[PDB]
Amino acid sequence: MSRIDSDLQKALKKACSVEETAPKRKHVRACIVYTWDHQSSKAVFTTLKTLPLANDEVQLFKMLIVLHKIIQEGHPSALAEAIRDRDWIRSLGRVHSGGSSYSKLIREYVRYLVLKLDFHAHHRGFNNGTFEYEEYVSLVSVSDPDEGYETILDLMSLQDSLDEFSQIIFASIQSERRNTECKISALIPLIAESYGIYKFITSMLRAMHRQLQPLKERYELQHARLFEFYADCSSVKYLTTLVTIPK
Amino acid sequence: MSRIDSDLQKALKKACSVEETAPKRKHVRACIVYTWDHQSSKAVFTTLKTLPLANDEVQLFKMLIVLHKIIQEGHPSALAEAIRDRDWIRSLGRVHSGGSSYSKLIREYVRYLVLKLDFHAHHRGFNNGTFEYEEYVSLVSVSDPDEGYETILDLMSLQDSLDEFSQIIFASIQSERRNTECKISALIPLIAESYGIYKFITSMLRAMHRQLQPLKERYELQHARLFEFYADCSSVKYLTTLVTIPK
Amino acid sequence: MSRIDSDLQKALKKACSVEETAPKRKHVRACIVYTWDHQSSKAVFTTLKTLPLANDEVQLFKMLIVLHKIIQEGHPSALAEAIRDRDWIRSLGRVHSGGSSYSKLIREYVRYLVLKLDFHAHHRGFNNGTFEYEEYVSLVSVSDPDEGYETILDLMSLQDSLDEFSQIIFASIQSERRNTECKISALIPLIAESYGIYKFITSMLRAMHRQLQPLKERYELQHARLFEFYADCSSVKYLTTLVTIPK
Amino acid sequence: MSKQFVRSAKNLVKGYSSTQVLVRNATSNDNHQVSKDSLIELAEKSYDSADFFEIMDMLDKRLNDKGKYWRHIAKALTVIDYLIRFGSENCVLWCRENLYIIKTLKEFRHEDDEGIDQGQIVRVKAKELTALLSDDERLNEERNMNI
Amino acid sequence: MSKQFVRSAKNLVKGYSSTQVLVRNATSNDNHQVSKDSLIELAEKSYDSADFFEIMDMLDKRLNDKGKYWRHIAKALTVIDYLIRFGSENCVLWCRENLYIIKTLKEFRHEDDEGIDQGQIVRVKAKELTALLSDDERLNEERNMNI
Amino acid sequence: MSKQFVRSAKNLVKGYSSTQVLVRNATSNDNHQVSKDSLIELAEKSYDSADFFEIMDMLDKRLNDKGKYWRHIAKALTVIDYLIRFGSENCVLWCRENLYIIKTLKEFRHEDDEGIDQGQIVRVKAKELTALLSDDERLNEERNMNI
Amino acid sequence: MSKQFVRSAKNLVKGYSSTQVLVRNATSNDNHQVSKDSLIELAEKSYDSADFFEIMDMLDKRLNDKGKYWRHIAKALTVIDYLIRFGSENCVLWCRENLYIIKTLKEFRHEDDEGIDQGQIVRVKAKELTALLSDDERLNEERNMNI
């Protein structure tokens, strides 16, 4: 450990706060703004490995919300270290064995993150947390269109798992009836990725459609799920306030 | 409402505090000590009727813990007003309809209180919250021993429901796994009544046994449940601290 | 005695201090407001026995003022307890016979108060401290007209005793040139009553006379005695620094 | 300047609610008249069984207060007049059911502060306010127009 | 040191009588067990029927008091236990009439990590003290010998 | 009034340069929209390469700042938006290199009941400001005309 | 008013015994002639041979005292005059042994324009008091009747 890591460690205690209220944007921001300042993210993972993490399941779900926001928002190093350490993330999926209801939310989030990180390592020449329309990756994909079809169908396989996990969170919210705040906070980064992945398939599909059929029928089902998910979020009386529309 | 009720109303907000931590002994004491000072308890029920009570199930279970401690600890008026208003207590059993797990704890507590208050109104010439060995009621009962047998068998029917409800709380504790504090707090007054009812049957049974058979076999099952319940409480790492032994 | 009674026992200790000024108004408010809060006044009469009286006459002189205000202002129980404890009030007149600068005044409160309480017990079915228009009891008094005539003409003999008591204290103020501060205070309850008793008889005399002569001459003699009192109390103008202007 | 900070510290120490701190800033030794937006906010708050207790409990503390603070009592009687005309029926039922603290204030008296007799402001407010509570027909008329 | 000056300043400001300052200096957060000379002085003072209330009303404040000062509640239970053993019968008649103030303490609880040990001293003194009020043959034997 | 004296006292105690006191007096909790003369003075001062850091380091403190002062973050986003439109190119090169400080604000959130409206002013200024850094043809057209 | 609070603060700080605080509150700059009940209480207290020195040593401080407080010297001469008439013989034996403290006052002088009138009250009390110590047949007749 070193004195610059101590500045970040103050924020990580407060972002993984002791109970099932939201992880404050102020402490998640302090980690993200650190991750850009120090150009690299080994300190943030080395902190999560040495944290009182697996002490109880409420803080371990908070840690997965915070860790998703840091990979998504942060410098490209946050994702590059997550591509290396996806097996540490996978180990978190084991440490509470799916018993009481709150543990099932953890296991489906770990399966989602391990799928996302597997997909960045395996498939794309693209390394941003949120997806965005990288022109060189799009041009090289449409120039290779049988792999281009595999790219939209594999990227759709993430949007399928994103959608299935959103229904786990919604059913778990509705069956518990009260203390929603951390569960709905977990919907916030999934909302931003849901729009980011949607914008990427839309822009890649447009490019491939003009550069050249059935992907439009698949796109209508994914678009139907997108508009269903934002209607489902519109019901949620806190979550709706802050995002300036779940787009 | 009147200015002396305002002194009690401050304590009742804090004893029914907004979430599933314990109801503090300091605020429950402020209500009990009021109830002895003003010799009467109509203000404490009139406050619970006009409270933001049925706003959410967490505060309604807290209110039933506090209301049990006030009937049990407080001046004989607290029980006499509870004997009049057992139908208001019964209405609380309806207001959350047994859905999410926390509501089932409320419905079994309301059934227990309505059974206790039915028993004081129906059966005994005895009006203390905790039971204790009232010599005149014991002498008049042993002087009437077919009703004396009905008295110990009816008082045993309360200890049966006390024991069945304790298993609802223990199973609900173990299935939820964490945030036990209000549920174990609900065990505290049930523990004091479990010993108080046990001391009364033991003292009444001794008196009736010497004043004159099968009630000793019933007493061994009730005693076995008593020693089982205090072993079950001994497991509980907070509750054990304060009672100076669950006797 | 119980803990709530400690609130009142502090206040009467400050009202019955060793200073020969008025009782501070804030302590008489504490005794009147206690009497209204607890809806029953027996603790004030008990506390008045517990106090060391006669041994320095400034305690007994003020204590008689304070009790007069409490009977007049307080909850109707203060009148009901004074109707019983009239024999203790009579004992206050005996205990310091002669042997003082102002024992005639001490006895003149006792004589006035005993006659006041005699009237409250027999001559009406009402129960209030300051005399006022109880609506049904007024209608009963015209229904029973000669008992109403005796009620108001005896109440005039009380008002003549109120006025002769005021002349006694005025003459005593003409004697106590070197030290007067409390003798004006002894007038204070008399002043407020003298206007209310005037209102009460004026309304009852007019309603009786018109519905059923020299009672108009009796009424004007009392009208003139009010203006004689209002002039006399204005001459002792230091009284106005305690009270309102007398009216 | 010192009182404005030190009162802000006493608000933290006693732990006061935002409802208590409003009522408390409204009724404060401060020589300024109680502002119309403060009075109408306490009337607007009255329609809540959770806040109405805190408002009436702080006004009942301030109506009790020592002689040194006649400034509190004068404002507290001002706030009660406004609350019975503008406010919820609970304000009137409360004020009618413990009238005696207002009616007992009517004799109040602080004196030789600098030489003057200082109670008359309390005594006029308490007299007209107790008259207005007793004139139930004037009060229900006044309320029905203003509401 | 400064808490001893500040405590003496608060004893001036509130204006407490010398009998109250004796009790509120005796049952105080200095945590030395309460002095045997002060206990017998309170037991002698208890026979003055005017000065009696000053002792017992301060012990009612100290038994009522916040959880942070478990120290007060423990010493106040000690001072009462001495006063029923060796003080005037008027202390027993007072303590019998409002027994509930102590009897409600039997379940008292405070925590700072290990603070359950501090709750234990309060609970055992409240339990012994209620056992002493309830054993009438013990208390009249004990008082007959002690007087 | 006293917060204006106290703020002037804190500006002495920390020893801030007159250029810092201009920014920290300009983007401050007085909540009047920031003055058009102060904005053009900061845009002129930005051309002094030594005094540049004093402006931008204070805006980095005000963009970093606590949630309680959403007022600072909104005005600091306004002062930056003017400085990229009408200040030196050195303010654009600084603001481009550490864009993340603003870009992370787009999701900012504060609450006091209705406080979501205050979060909205922060969010819309952060969104417009990142749209202005990202539209290079807009920003170089805008700067060519504004210079 | 504040001099009454400050005087009570100085009586704490120096730590004066309650018998000293009785004398130093009795013979003080409030300029109301000293109370007849306080004089007889000092005359009764004088019979306690331990507590005697606290009264007489404070009167030695007040007779020694600065010219600005001619008020102290006049009242201290009054308190001594009562104490030789109606107090213990121990006050006469003390006052006889150090007569010079009073006897030197006969020529005392203070001035503020008209302040010669204030010097006159000191001088006449010192002269009457030394006439009373010197007339032994007066003082033993006076004491025999007064006792």
Residue numbers in the entry:
A (entry chain N), B (entry chain D), C (entry chain B): 1 to 212, 222 to 256
D (entry chain A), E (entry chain C), F (entry chain M), G (entry chain H): 1 to 147
What does the paper say about this structure?
Throughout this process in yeast, endocytic coat adaptors, Sla2 and Ent1, must remain attached to the plasma membrane to transmit force from the actin cytoskeleton required for successful membrane invagination. Here, we present a cryo-EM structure of a 16-mer complex of the ANTH and ENTH membrane-binding domains from Sla2 and Ent1 bound to PIP2 that constitutes the anchor to the plasma membrane.
Within each AENTH tetramer, the interactions between the ANTH and ENTH domains are established through two main hetero-dimerization interfaces and one homo-dimerization ANTH-ANTH interface. A second interface in the AENTH tetramer involves residues K10, K13, and K14 of ANTH. Altogether, these results indicate that lysines of the ANTH-ENTH interface 2 are essential for the assembly of the tetrameric lipid-binding AENTH unit and for the AENTH function in vivo.
